[PDB]
């Protein structure tokens, strides 16, 4: 009655400052009806949610879009920080329809240049949503794959209802051999979290360069809405932040400094991570007889957690998934939820 990601073992290192380029196949292959309007629509559909979902857990990570039609790599959205720009770029395409084959080889190389500008710390990383069963590669590939590795470009693909060796090779090679990234869905619902699991950072057993100090500053809000002006959109922004150093206005964002070129976040963006940094050991289910704790949830307050002797119901499930490190109990949904939304183990918080 359990399927648990046993140990939260980075254990000490995960890739926070990310630079993810999402690439989508846009081919007639995407026009087959396994998915309702097509795969392609559900894709762009499921892509949309992803963006916030991404930017939610990653308010510090640039991102851009690529489509693959007519055997062509065709950037749609410059890699940037705002979600909305990215977000809108989809719907536009979402109505348009794919044409011609997918040229994977075109894809990566356009990325390979695309991911060059980002700093060293930024995880240079790509994600693929392949739809076809083969490719149309204008040039070599096995050589091309290697070039990625030379650039330390992790990749990950979301295979369609099949497996193709080359990408299966691609992930394996590009994740320094150690592979898990060639996931291909078997069910649509799987695809849902398939995006969601892509949200988090992604080390396993890493090699360690010099991970340096990251210079950055913090802006401060303004008051006079009338005095509107701007310095990144040059519009009349009612009034916003100011560089701690450049000391110039900026449209509200976690943006970089359009005046003296540095990263400017608040802090919450940092805070948004830390649950990614040190997550929690799962709350453990309890014995069918040994619990004998209060007849009321701790986190929540639900009287049950058992059934007070109900033949094949009370002994059926010790509804007492409970924490170890604080050794205090917890409700069913609570542990479902405290592991989900806010992590912050209450029992382990208060002692």
């Amino acid at each position: 009655k359990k399927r648990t990601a046993k140990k939260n073992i980075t254990p000490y290192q995960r890739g926070i400052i990310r630079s993810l380029i999402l690439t989508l196949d846009c081919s007639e292959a995407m026009l087959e009806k396994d998915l309702r309007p097509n795969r392609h629509a559900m894709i762009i559909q499921y892509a949309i949610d992803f963006v916030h979902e991404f930017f939610d857990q990653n308010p510090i990570s640039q991102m851009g879009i690529i489509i693959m039609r007519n055997g062509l790599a065709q950037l749609v959205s410059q890699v940037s920080g705002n979600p909305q720009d990215h977000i809108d770029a989809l719907k536009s395409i979402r109505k348009q329809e794919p044409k011609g084959n997918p040229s994977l080889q075109n894809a990566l190389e356009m990325a390979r240049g695309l991911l060059l500008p980002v700093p060293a710390h930024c995880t240079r990383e790509v994600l693929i949503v392949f739809g076809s069963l083969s490719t149309t590669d204008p040039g070599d590939i096995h050589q091309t794959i290697d070039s990625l590795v030379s650039e330390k470009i992790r990749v990950k693909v979301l295979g369609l209802s099949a497996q193709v060796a080359i990408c299966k090779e691609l992930c394996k090679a590009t994740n320094y051999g150690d592979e898990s990234f060639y996931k291909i869905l078997l069910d649509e619902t799987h695809l849902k979290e398939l995006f969601n699991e892509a949200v988090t950072p992604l080390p396993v057993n890493k090699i360690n360069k010099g991970f340096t100090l990251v210079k950055m500053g913090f802006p401060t809000r303004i008051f006079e809405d009338t005095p509107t002006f701007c310095s990144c959109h040059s519009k009349l922004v009612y009034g916003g932040y100011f560089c701690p150093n450049c000391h110039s206005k900026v449209c509200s964002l976690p943006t970089v400094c359009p005046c003296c070129d540095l990263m400017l976040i608040l802090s919450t963006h940092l805070a948004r991570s830390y649950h990614h940094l040190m997550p929690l050991k799962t709350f453990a289910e309890v014995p069918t007889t040994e619990k004998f704790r209060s007849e009321d949830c701790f986190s929540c307050q639900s009287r049950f957690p058992x059934x007070x002797x109900x033949x094949x119901x009370x002994x059926x499930x010790x509804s007492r998934y409970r924490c170890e490190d604080c050794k205090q109990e917890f409700c069913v949904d609570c542990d479902v939820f405290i592991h989900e939304i806010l992590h912050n183990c209450p029992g382990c918080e208060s002692k």
Partner: protein, 753 residues
């Protein structure tokens, strides 16, 4: 690993291990001790070779008695397959248990592969390769090299320097696979063709084509060191029968005519030399008048011109060829021969002649005698040996006559000569085929089989295990069919008896286009071509039969659509083009974009090559293979086969097609990592479920019977999707992958009964 089979450490080189392998080795060792023949169905989807070599190597090095090993292979591909295999097992043997091994073993393949001197290495035909590599180091030519070293003498030059250093003991210790051997011998300038030829005398394990064990003219130099009683391994020998049929002999009259002039060229040669240097020829007569001249009728260090088409230098006699002792007597009767043959050449219709029936008939139309008839070859052999000719292509034909003569002198009543007046394919033209053929495989099998009781045979596709003991009459012990153990799908078989229109699809109907089937077949192919990722092959019952399908499909709009998805590669009759094409097909499969290949089950592709995961994900058996496209050759052979053995053509027929049908499929899987889809496309397969190799039919489920395309495509559609999941339980694999040194300890301690 290093465990016990109740008597022997098992220096297993693969940490993970499969229960069948032990189930395998357990039985063969049992068979190893108490001599037997006792074939074994072994699903090669696992490592059968390691399972073999594991038991063997220790058993050689554990017990003291049998210091030699004989492992016979279908082809050099098998050779090189096994060569690297043992080498790493052998290398693992040094890594884990020091070095107490002193074991060397290698395989001879040919001149053409092993002729390292670039001259004939450029040249193609092995006989010419045989001719010049002879002329490289030939008894006359080496005498031309030693007695009269001249510009007419060209050589590999290695067999000299090889002889300089090599022939006192081996190169140091390696089981030098061609990868290792071809380089290593190049550096020290060796054509290892002679390295092994001398090393014949040394190695404790050997590997070569069944011919080298069965082709008597090459399987002649059998020595007690190389043979006496050691262990025999026949791997993938499901098709051994057809190999024994070796004693095949058909008569290209056109080549035969060239032989006549070659005979005259000989006739002129002997006459002209008897004019000039007849004394040593008379001395050869004196080398003849003594008796058999065993000194140089058998021993020739680089000379022997004609091979021994007879069994390995046994079926001969000693009484001289009477008069023919005089070559002029001898030359004359040879002309009697060809002319008799030439006389027999132009029979209006097909005529089948049993040897004895033909025997006096020879004497009838020309009073020749059988006793000289065998003597021809050696008498010829010395004759050309005495005259150091500049070519053999003429004389190949000549010796073939002698070879024919010897053969027809040799055997009877199990063998027969038939002359169709032509090839009926383009009938009513002059091209008669004085075909004299073997009929019983076992006869050629008997001798080597007679020698040693440590005889072992196994293919990945032996089915059924009865015909071979039936056909060869041989005395087996145990024949166990090995159910492949799977805790998972691991592959998919399918049967398409009918299409979407439920129209039964076949090939026995004709070699022609019942347009329903092929139009149905375009669909079948294309939808599959769509669904699978790269790597897919199809097989056809016959080349030109396939040609029909293609041509019509080419006309239809079928091909272009699949051209959209995958890449297409046909099979060719020539090997060269094929050989090129194949590697590309590998490259496309290895590369991203999908591809597809077509060939024929009887084809050389189906015989040697192998298909892994990317290289093969789906196969297709278009139709059920058959051969009565051809003539009584089988039937006349069937006569003896059927009249003696309680076998009907169908018995032979229905099995042998399967003997070739699954023969393709075994290549589809290499490691238990791999998987694939195996479809069958013919109505009659439904009746044919009961002839498969056991592990196949076990892998075959009932509901897959007489599937149509629609029902088929779903299962693959899932199976592909399903298998593509990282289906890694990593816990139930204890039973199926036998927790290493522990569960084999555990379960076989529990399997102690």
């Amino acid at each position: 690993m290093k465990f016990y089979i109740d008597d022997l450490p098992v220096l297993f080189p693969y940490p993970k291990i499969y229960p069948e392998q032990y189930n395998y080795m357990c039985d063969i060792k049992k068979t190893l001790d108490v001599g037997g023949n006792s074939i074994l169905e072994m699903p090669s989807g696992t490592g059968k070779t390691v399972s073999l070599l594991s038991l063997t190597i220790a058993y050689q090095m554990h017990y003291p008695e049998h210091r030699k090993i004989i492992y016979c292979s279908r082809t050099m591909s098998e050779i090189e397959k096994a060569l690297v295999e043992l080498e790493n097992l052998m290398d693992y043997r040094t890594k884990e248990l020091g070095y107490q091994e002193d074991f060397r073993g290698l395989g001879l393949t040919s001149r053409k592969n092993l002729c390292l001197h670039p001259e004939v290495s450029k040249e193609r035909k092995g006989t010419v390769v045989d001719e010049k590599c002879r002329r490289m180091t030939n008894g006359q030519a080496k005498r031309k090299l030693e007695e009269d070293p001249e510009a007419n003498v060209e050589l590999c030059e290695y067999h000299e320097n090889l002889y300089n250093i090599e022939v006192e003991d081996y190169l140091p210790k390696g089981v030098f696979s061609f990868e290792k051997l071809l380089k290593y011998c190049e550096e020290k300038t060796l054509c290892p063709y002679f390295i092994v030829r001398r090393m014949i005398s040394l190695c404790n394990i050997i590997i070569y084509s069944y011919h080298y064990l069965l082709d008597p003219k090459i399987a002649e130099r059998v020595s007690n060191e190389v043979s006496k009683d050691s262990i025999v391994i026949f791997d993938e020998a499901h098709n051994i029968d057809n190999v024994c049929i070796s004693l095949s002999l058909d008569l290209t009259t056109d080549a035969l005519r060239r032989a006549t002039r070659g005979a005259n060229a000989l006739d002129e040669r002997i006459s002209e030399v008897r004019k000039v240097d007849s004394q040593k020829l008379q001395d050869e007569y004196e080398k003849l008048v003594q008796g058999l001249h065993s000194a140089d009728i058998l021993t020739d260090q680089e000379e022997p011109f004609v091979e021994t088409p007879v069994l390995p230098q046994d079926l001969l006699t000693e009484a001289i060829p009477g008069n023919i002792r005089r070559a002029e007597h001898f030359v004359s009767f040879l002309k009697r021969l060809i002319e008799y043959l030439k006389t027999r050449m132009k029979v209006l219709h097909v005529i089948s002649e049993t040897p004895k029936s033909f025997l006096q008939h020879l004497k009838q139309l020309t009073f020749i005698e059988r006793k000289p008839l065998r003597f021809c070859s050696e008498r010829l052999s010395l004759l050309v040996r005495t005259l150091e000719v500049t070519e053999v292509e003429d004389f190949t034909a000549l010796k073939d006559i002698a070879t024919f003569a010897t053969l027809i002198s040799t055997y009877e009543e199990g063998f027969l000569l038939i002359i169709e007046p032509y090839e009926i394919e383009n009938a009513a033209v002059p091209n008669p085929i004085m075909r004299f053929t073997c009929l019983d495989a076992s006869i050629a099998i008997k001798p080597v089989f007679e020698r040693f009781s440590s005889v072992i045979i196994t293919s990945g596709t032996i089915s059924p295990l009865d015909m071979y003991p039936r056909m060869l009459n041989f005395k087996t012990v145990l024949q166990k069919s090995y159910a492949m153990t799977l805790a998972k799908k691991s592959f998919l078989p399918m049967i398409i008896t009918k299409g979407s229109d439920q129209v039964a699809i076949s090939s026995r109907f004709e070699i022609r286009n019942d347009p329903s089937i092929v139009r149905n077949y375009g669909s079948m192919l294309v939808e599959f071509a769509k669904i699978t990722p790269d790597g897919m092959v199809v097989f056809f019952p016959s080349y030109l039969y396939m040609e029909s399908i293609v041509s019509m499909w080419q006309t239809m709009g079928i091909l272009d659509e699949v051209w959209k998805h995958k890449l297409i590669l046909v099979e060719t009759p020539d090997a060269q083009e094929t050989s090129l094409a194949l590697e590309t097909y590998r490259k496309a499969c290895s590369n991203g974009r999908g591809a597809i290949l077509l060939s024929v089950a009887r084809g050389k592709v189906s015989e040697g090559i192998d298909f892994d995961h990317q290289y093969g994900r789906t196969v297709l058996m278009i139709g059920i293979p058959f051969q009565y496209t051809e003539s009584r050759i089988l039937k006349a052979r069937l006569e003896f086969m059927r009249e003696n053995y309680r076998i009907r053509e169908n018995d032979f027929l229905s099995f042998d097609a399967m003997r070739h049908a699954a023969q393709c499929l075994g290549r589809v899987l290499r490691g238990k990592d791999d998987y694939g889809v195996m479809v069958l496309a013919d109505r009659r397969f439904s009746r044919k479920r009961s002839q498969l190799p056991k592990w196949i039919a076990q892998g075959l489920s009932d509901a897959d019977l007489n599937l149509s395309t629609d029902m088929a495509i779903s299962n693959t559609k899932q199976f592909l999707r399903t298998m593509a999941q990282p289906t890694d339980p990593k816990d139930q694999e204890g039973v199926s992958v036998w927790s290493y040194e522990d569960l084999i300890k555990h379960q076989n301690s529990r399997k102690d009964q």
